[PDB]
Amino acid sequence: SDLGKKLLEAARAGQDDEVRILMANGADVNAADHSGDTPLHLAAMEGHLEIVEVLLKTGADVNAHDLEGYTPLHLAAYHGHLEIVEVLLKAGADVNAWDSYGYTPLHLAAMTGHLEIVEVLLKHGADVNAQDKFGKTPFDLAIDNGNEDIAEVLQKAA
Amino acid sequence: PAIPSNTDYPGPHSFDVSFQQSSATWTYSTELKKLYCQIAKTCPIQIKVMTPPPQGAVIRAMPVYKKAEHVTEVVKRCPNHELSREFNEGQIAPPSHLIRVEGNSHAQYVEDPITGRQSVLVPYEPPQVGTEFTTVLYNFMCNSSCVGGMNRRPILIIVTLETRDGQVLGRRCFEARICACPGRDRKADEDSI
Ligand SMILES: [Zn+2]
């Protein structure tokens, strides 16, 4: 818990060296805080790519769900971290994982206007027909939030 | 009274609170009067007046639970966040306070001895010159979901314009959701329609 808590803090803060020394000293890579977020969740959310790579290569669970049902890929997609989305996908992230409102990563990328992330998600088999709790597709979230470049792309993939 | 009022009160200086995206991960719904923001990250809030407040006036931000069942309970940080090193190195802010002010060495942290209410005050300052608004930078220091703290209970932020002696000159309220993906929580609220 000592080392787990320290790893969760260093991962959110982007303290590359502290993460590396904590893993070396036996910190639990899948330590989870009271929101159910792992170091991999926090680093993915905050855009700390090197920390993400260190956590995956030391056995981070790429498809861990926090208490909201977010995987690290959900957080990387929402927050616009393309390099991290690519690394998570190459480490076997579930491209069509759904959170506690049935949002997929393609929903979150469509909603936030991250065109390049939409394209990499589609290449890895993101489901254009996936529906959230409210019957909305990523195309519909794109239209609602005025993301037209993304809307066109999602149509041509439908 | 003992329970803090949460009814907008423009009062004699026409006190209003607004949000503006500039060129940050927060989103404000003018429709739901609801701020969606991330833990510990800068949330700028704009104060408008029409006439100058008196000498020694202040702006206070106090969190209160929104739901009738919870309103008597002081909003403060969960033990996990209060006791952590994270966010707590070298603060004027006591580590139990949910609301901090960023960028003002004149922030005063208050805890009422009777009600136990925690709040943070700054001296009222008129806008820069040519600028319309007095900007206050807030940080919210727990997630809405924090177990042993807010525990998924919705809160209001009550912003009050006050004289030095605590007379309320103006009040505005908005809901705050502290979460991982503010736009996602906002979209889910909107689509529940
Ligand atoms: Zn907390």
Residue numbers in the entry:
A (entry chain B): 2 to 159
B (entry chain A): 125 to 147, 152 to 321
Paper text:
Here we describe the characterization of Designed Ankyrin Repeat Proteins (DARPins) that were selected as tight binders against all folded domains of p63.
To identify the exact interaction interfaces of the DARPins to the p63 DBD we crystallized both DARPins in complex with the p63 DBD. The structures revealed that both DARPins bind to the DNA-binding interface and interact with the helix H3, the preceding loop and the C-terminal part of β-sheet S10 as well as residues in loop L3. All these sites are involved in and crucial for DNA binding. All contacts between both proteins are summarized in Fig. 1D, E and Supplementary Fig. 1G-J. These data suggest that interaction with the DARPins competes with binding to DNA and that the DARPins act as a competitive inhibitor for DNA binding. Fluorophore-labeled DARPins were titrated with bacterially expressed and purified p63 isoforms and the data confirmed that both DARPins C14 and G4 bind to the DBD in both closed dimeric isoforms (TAp63α) as well as to open and tetrameric ones (ΔNp63α) with only weak influence on binding affinities.
